[PDB]
Amino acid sequence: TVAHQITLLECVGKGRYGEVWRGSWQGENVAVKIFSSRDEKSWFRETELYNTVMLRHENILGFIASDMTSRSTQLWLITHYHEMGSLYDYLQLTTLDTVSCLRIVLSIASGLAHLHIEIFGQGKPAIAHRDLKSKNILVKKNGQCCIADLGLAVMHSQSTNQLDVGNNPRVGTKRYMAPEVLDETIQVDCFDSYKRVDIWAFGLVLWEVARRMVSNGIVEDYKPPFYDVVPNDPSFEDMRKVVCVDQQRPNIPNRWFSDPTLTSLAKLMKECWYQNPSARLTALRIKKTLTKID
Ligand SMILES: CN1CCN(c2ccc(Nc3nccc(-c4c(-c5cccnc5)nn5c4COCC5)n3)cc2)CC1
């Protein structure tokens, strides 16, 4: 396998996802994610999606191989290596201009609309991600991004009209959970519920990015969504009180209203955050609006 022709060179991150290494695949740099022993289901689900679907797009992390190897058993997922790393890390490294901000959020919208749309082709089922955040989006050398971490993905096919929810005890990152997830009101048998959860998450990511775009000499420091009202590693109950009971949304800095681009992005992210999931914009409507914005 690719794993047997692959040498780990250096650990570029460790956390809740497991570990990510820069590896050498017959000399070529690749990313190797080593799953936690507790997270076999995420490895199995991502491997399943990458191997069984035509999941190949500029704005989705490029799959090379999955592998099992001794070191106990380790489960590896081998992909394209993006030397700039995650959007989370990148937003701490730098501020953005108008072109850079729009290129990042349009590229995320394009990946997410590509996951959400069924293609009959060639083709692919509709896919909801269910754990979108700035830490599982990669920054590419051209300034576009790509979406990673499909281990919670849910699939729908119009031909069979069947929802494939998989079998993974993992739940989303608590900070990014939509209100319907947190108060357990989500309609688990309707595919559209899952897409709407991605739109809430995407809204928070748009907020994270937009804070870092400079306008009229002013920029915000990088903060995660709800930095002001929940602690690090917030509990399910911490989040439930903020989003379901108090019905709070991230604050729009006043300085955005002196910039045409940030004014349009403030409009967009609030229509991602309707408490009523049915009222949120779709990934395709977001893509179209971002293509028009200057
Ligand atoms: C300050 N910095 C900058 C960049 N860093 C860095 C550099 C390169 C990469 N490369 C990379 N390429 C592809 C995927 C991933 C990856 C993946 C990944 C890899 C393989 C399969 N599926 C997901 N998960 N995560 C990441 C990175 O962020 C944490 C979560 N990383 C990373 C960081 C670390 C610290």
Q: DSSP assignment of 5-55, as one string?
A: GEEEEEEEEEETTEEEEEEEETTEEEEEEE--GGGHHHHHHHHHHHHHS--
* Nearest CA owner, ligand 1 atom 6: 85
Give the method of determination.
Answer: X-ray
Is residue 164 annotated as part of the catalytic site, yes or no? no
Cβ–ligand 1 contact at 133 (below 6 Å): no
Give the nearest ligand 1 atom to 81 CA: 12
Cβ–ligand 1 contact at 76 (below 6 Å): no
With beta carbons less than 8 A apart as the criterion, state whether 194 and 177 touch: no
**Single-letter residue type at 76:** W
Domain-wise residue ranges, the chain:
1-83, 84-294
Which resolution in angstroms does this entry have?
A: 1.8
Sign of CA dihedral 50, 109, 149, 151: negative
Give the Å distance between the CA of 45 and the centre of ligand 1.
19
Return the best residue to mutate from 6, 8, 12 for the ligand 1 pocket (most ligand atoms within 8 A of CB).
Answer: 12
Do β-strands 154-157 and 126-128 pair in parallel, antiparallel, or remain unpaired? antiparallel
